[PDB]
Amino acid sequence: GSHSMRYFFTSVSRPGRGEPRFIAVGYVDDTQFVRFDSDAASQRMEPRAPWIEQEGPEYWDGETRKVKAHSQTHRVDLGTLRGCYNQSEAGSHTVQRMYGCDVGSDWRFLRGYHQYAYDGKDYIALKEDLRSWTAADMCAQTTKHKWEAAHVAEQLRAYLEGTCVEWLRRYLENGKETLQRTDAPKTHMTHHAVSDHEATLRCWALSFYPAEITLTWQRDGEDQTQDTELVETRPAGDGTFQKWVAVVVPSGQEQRYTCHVQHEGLPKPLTLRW
Amino acid sequence: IQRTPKIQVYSRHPAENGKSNFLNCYVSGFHPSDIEVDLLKNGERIEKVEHSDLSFSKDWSFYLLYYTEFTPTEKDEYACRVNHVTLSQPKIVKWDRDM
Numbered sequence: 482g483s484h485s486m487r488y489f490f491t492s493v494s495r496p497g498r499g500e501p502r503f504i505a506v507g508y509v510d511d512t513q514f515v516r517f518d519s520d521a522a523s524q525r526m527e528p529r530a531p532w533i534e535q536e537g538p539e540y541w542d543g544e545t546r547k548v549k550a551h552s553q554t555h556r557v558d559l560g561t562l563r564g565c566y567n568q569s570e571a572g573s574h575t576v577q578r579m580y581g582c583d584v585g586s587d588w589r590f591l592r593g594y595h596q597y598a599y600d601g602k603d604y605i606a607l608k609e610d611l612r613s614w615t616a617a618d619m620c621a622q623t624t625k626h627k628w629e630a631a632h633v634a635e636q637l638r639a640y641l642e643g644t645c646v647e648w649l650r651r652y653l654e655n656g657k658e659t660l661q662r663t664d665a666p667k668t669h670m671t672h673h674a675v676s677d678h679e680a681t682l683r684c685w686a687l688s689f690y691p692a693e694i695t696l697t698w699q700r701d702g703e704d705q706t707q708d709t710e711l712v713e714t715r716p717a718g719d720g721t722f723q724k725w726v727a728v729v730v731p732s733g734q735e736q737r738y739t740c741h742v743q744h745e746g747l748p749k750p751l752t753l754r755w
Numbered sequence: 756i757q758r759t760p761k762i763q764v765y766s767r768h769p770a771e772n773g774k775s776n777f778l779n780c781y782v783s784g785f786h787p788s789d790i791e792v793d794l795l796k797n798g799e800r801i802e803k804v805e806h807s808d809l810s811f812s813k814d815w816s817f818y819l820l821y822y823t824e825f826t827p828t829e830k831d832e833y834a835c836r837v838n839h840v841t842l843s844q845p846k847i848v849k850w851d852r853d854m
């Protein structure tokens with residue numbers, strides 16, 4: 482199936498004293514593999530998956546250099562944006578940056594992206610062609626002009642289309658035992674009665690990877706969305722994911738309803754019935 | 756500009772009395788990132804709680820997993836207590852094994 486490598490960066494200003502809180506994380510697919518936290522004692526990019534531990538000190542030195550450079554760029558940008566929006570020194574503000582690459586099942590480049598937010602709202606993003614910018618407002622437009630004149634897009638595109646994909650291939654190889662493994666959902670159904678006329682059927686999917694999943698209910702073989710509740714997919718904490726979907730039914734009619742589970746780890750979708 | 760957290764409290768494994776399980780509180784969809792999350796045993800804060808590295812979703816909202824070991828029993832009540840700038844009062848979500 483398809484894979485992705487993504488880096489996420491958050492900076493939160495600290496008005497009264499010192500530099501922003503800066504947190505960076507990298508992921509392959511739905512697996513975190515590196516982190517940096519400005520508040521942590523190492524001041525190094527740190528491993529978070531066993532397969533990256535392979536990398537030698539030259540890797541760790543390079544990533545540490547790049548991540549600290551990002552933190553400084555955020556620091557500077559927080560100042561610039563404060564000034565552009567005419568904000569005071571009193572308030573904490575946030576910048577967020579995300580970038581990375583998708584590849585298909587052949588591990589060839591599909592798509593790249595590079596996007597930036599201020600105070601949790603879109604600011605500027607590279608368009609899908611990796612050649613132009615989308616700027617949300619006039620501050621961001623000024624930023625667009627500055628990045629156009631400095632040919633930023635060109636540099637990023639070369640990373641996103643090339644370097645990014647090459648790293649992702651490396652890690653998929655080195656981490657193959659988990660990263661190339663699919664863990665099919667382990668499913669069951671539970672039954673709860675509210676009253677003697679209403680029952681809840683809950684269809685559980687546990688211990689699956691990757692996170693993408695579809696849970697759907699049918700009544701007499703027809704899709705039913707009313708009287709259903711789907712919780713957000715959630716991490717188990719062991720690397721796998723959980724989800725459930727529930728339907729309310731008339732007590733005694735439980736046999737009409739079926740739960741349908743789609744996942745990359747299942748060669749055919751599964752059907753569960755009470 | 757502020758987005759209130761969504762909260763799920765749950766175990767990593769089917770909840771079995773007597774066996775070392777893991778209690779999770781998953782907070783998501785929130786902005787800004789500053790948040791206070793505690794796991795409670797019979798209303799009292801659990802001290803050894805860890806959390807994931809701060810990340811965020813496509814809509815820029817933040818998510819964190821807070822977690823602690825525990826060997827469940829059938830007397831002990833568990834909950835997750837969250838405070839955030841969007842909340843006038845701390846929100847408590849009780850752990851219910853069936854969710």
Ligand code: MET
Nearest residue numbers: 488505526544547548551
């Ligand atoms: C950890 S910051 C560097 C991220 C990524 N490896 C890059 O070269 O852009």
